[PDB]
């Protein structure tokens, strides 16, 4: 039938978590999407021959650590950790998100992909090599994306899926 994958997109405000998701779900680029709306979106795709139902939690809201919040996040099987290549602070925040993923999942090996989004923009303050260094230290893949042009958007989610497959062994 379908193999279900629960994906969770995390990272600072304004990096493109919603644009990335809606590009995958609805195939268009949203200029302004309510920055406060957190929701899960379901999508059927074929990845490497396998029919997949992706359940994608696009995170938002206040920073808080309620039990309900922890419980929503730890249903994630894999995580897209997203920063913008023109937002140094959002890159620096990646480690915090990874730490919270490890905590709620209670594991050192959680399927994860590092995503530098907005690669269409000229005002790059985060070097590709800087983000690669981080990704290699974590043992995770790294990919640059543009939710605006769709460059790399499919690959980023599919790569996460393949990371979940490897985790299952």
Query: Which positions from 92 to 121 touch ligand 05I by CB under 6 A, shown as an x/- string?
Result: -x--xx--xx--x-----------------
> Which partner in ligand 05I, ligand GDP, Mg ion, none is near 19 (CB below 5 to 8 A by kind)?
ligand GDP
Would you count residue 73 as binding ligand 05I (CB under 6 A)?
yes
Q: How far apart are CA 163 and CA 158, in angstroms?
A: 9
Using the rule CB under 6 A, which residue among 31, 48, 63, 169 binds ligand 05I?
63
Contacts of 45 (CB under 8 A, 6+ apart): 51, 52, 54, 158
What is the rounded end-to-end Cα distance, in angstroms, of the chain? Answer: 21
Cβ closest to ligand 05I, residue 77 vs residue 93: 93
Query: Which positions from 16 to 45 touch Mg ion by CB under 5 A, shown as an x/- string?
Result: --x---------------------------
Q: Is the dihedral of CA 23, 28, 33, 38 positive or negative?
A: negative
Considering only the stretches 57-65, 109-117, 137-145, 156-164, report the one whose residues sit in contact with ligand 05I under the rule CB under 6 A. 57-65
Contact predicate 146/118, CB 8 Å: yes
Q: Report in angstroms the alpha-carbon separations of 34 from 31, 38, 59, 60, 127.
A: 10, 9, 12, 9, 29
Taking the complex as a whole, the smallest distance from the CB of residue 66 to ligand 05I amounts, in Å, to: 8
Would you count residue 16 as binding ligand GDP (CB under 6 A)?
yes
What is the greatest pairwise CA distance in the chain?
44
Residues 117-136, interacting with ligand GDP (CB under 6 A): 117-118, 120-121
Contacts of 150 (CB under 8 A, 6+ apart): 23, 29
Would you count residue 78 as binding ligand GDP (CB under 6 A)?
no
User: Which residues would be at the binding site for ligand GDP (CB under 6 A)?
Assistant: 13-19, 31-33, 35, 117-118, 120-121, 146-148
């Amino acid at each position: 039938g379908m193999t279900e994958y629960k994906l969770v997109v995390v990272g600072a405000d304004g990096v493109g978590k919603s644009a990335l998701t809606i590009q995958l779900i609805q195939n268009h680029f949203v200029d302004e999407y309510d920055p406060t709306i957190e929701d899960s979106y379901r999508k059927q795709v074929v990845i490497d021959g396998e029919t997949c139902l992706l359940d994608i939690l696009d995170t938002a809201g206040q920073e808080e650590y309620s039990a309900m919040r922890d419980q929503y996040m730890r249903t994630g099987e894999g995580f897209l950790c997203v920063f913008a290549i023109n937002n140094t602070k959002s890159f620096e925040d990646i480690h915090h998100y990874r730490e919270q993923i490890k905590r709620v999942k209670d594991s050192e090996d959680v399927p994860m992909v590092l995503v530098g989004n907005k690669c269409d923009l000229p005002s790059r303050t985060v070097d590709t090599k800087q983000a690669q260094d981080l990704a290699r230290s974590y043992g995770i893949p790294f990919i640059e994306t543009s939710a605006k042009t769709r460059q790399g958007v499919d690959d980023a989610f599919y790569t996460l899926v393949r990371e979940i497959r490897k985790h299952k062994e």
